[PDB]
Model the fold of this input.
Amino acid sequence: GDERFYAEHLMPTLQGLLDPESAHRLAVRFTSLGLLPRARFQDSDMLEVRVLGHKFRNPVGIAAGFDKHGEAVDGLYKMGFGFVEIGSVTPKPQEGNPRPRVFRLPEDQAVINRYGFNSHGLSVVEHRLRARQQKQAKLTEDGLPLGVNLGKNKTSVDAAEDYAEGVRVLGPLADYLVVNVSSPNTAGLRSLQGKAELRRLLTKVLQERDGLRRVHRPAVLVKIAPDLTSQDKEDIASVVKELGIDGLIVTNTTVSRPAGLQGALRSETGGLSGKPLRDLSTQTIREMYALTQGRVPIIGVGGVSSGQDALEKIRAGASLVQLYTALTFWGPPVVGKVKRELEALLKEQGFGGVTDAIGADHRR
Ligand SMILES: Cc1cc2nc3c(=O)[nH]c(=O)nc-3n(C[C@H](O)[C@H](O)[C@H](O)COP(=O)(O)O)c2cc1C
Ligand SMILES: COc1cccc(-c2csc(N/N=C/c3ccccc3C(=O)O)n2)c1
Ligand SMILES: O=C(O)c1cc(=O)[nH]c(=O)[nH]1
Done:
């Protein structure tokens, strides 16, 4: 469980042998088998957060896209994440884009991916989650909630019906659902972020959700891009408040390529994640928090690899944070590292707990 060993030796050597997709698949295998150090870090009460109708024993989650098909959920809690998001899941199975479709930018601590929603489909994931449904109910009660991220098939004619199907099938198995309208890798998907289409889409989603039995009724969150115009952001905030959307996930990967990227593969098509996304994401959180008057829970994600990164997002308005790319460079010890550093920084800055820090920047 040594950060230095994983960061300086183990992870780099494994990356030396395996292309990123092979490495991802192997990581999922290892994780599902529990082949990792069980956490040194025991979660402090300071790290607990209550939001989305749930207790989270720590605010650090695993972002969607690592466990796309719900295969490694328990290994992910063992890794120390306070909550787990699986997906994106599409209604029907689909292969996603041709390989290669994932690229490392080691010099930038960044990744570019164009998976294209490769997915086992709703039915397979439903059965997988059903097999451990009662274990999840206890985990959730214990402060370890589960989120399910919903996508749409490449060849679907009715985007809203794809999401509605997802709500009906995986909604009853989830503590929260994510409407992913921000994947850069599915044609036309991000235009679902525009006002009229979003309102129509989310109205249908919320109706389907409200039609589920009470104990099986998840919160609904919208995951947005970091590449939105100011107009897009205003409109989303407006729709979210008009419809009573439960929360936002901020943000997905960027189609931008910030100046300064050094990686040889920087011009590959796809969404960029990791360090170059970090502050762009933090700023989007800051803006969405203000537009929603601090009343809509935000899960902050984008380039988090340290306690400081996490705290900056929390102070900007995030109630919870996720990471993914940092894990691909630092390995499993990064989770305890982030939690440990976050706790220390909360103390240094005079916060009683994570909850006190949420949106602190806006009250300065
Ligand atoms: C390889 C890869 C696959 C991803 N797949 C999904 C996905 O299926 N659905 C989704 O909402 N986000 C997906 N993401 C985005 C992450 O959830 C997250 O929003 C983004 O990577 C920023 O966080 P990070 O910098 O910590 O990696 C993916 C990211 C990566 C790198
Ligand atoms: C070292 O032993 C373990 C044990 C459990 C998980 C892991 C683990 C978690 S993530 C990971 N590597 N991930 C690599 C990866 C994932 C998605 C996309 C790209 C990459 C990559 O660039 O290698 N490995 C490693
Ligand atoms: O499947 C994808 O390629 C994918 C989806 C998503 O939401 N974000 C991302 O970076 N890639």
User: Anything to note?
Assistant: DSSP finds 13 helices and 13 strands in the chain.
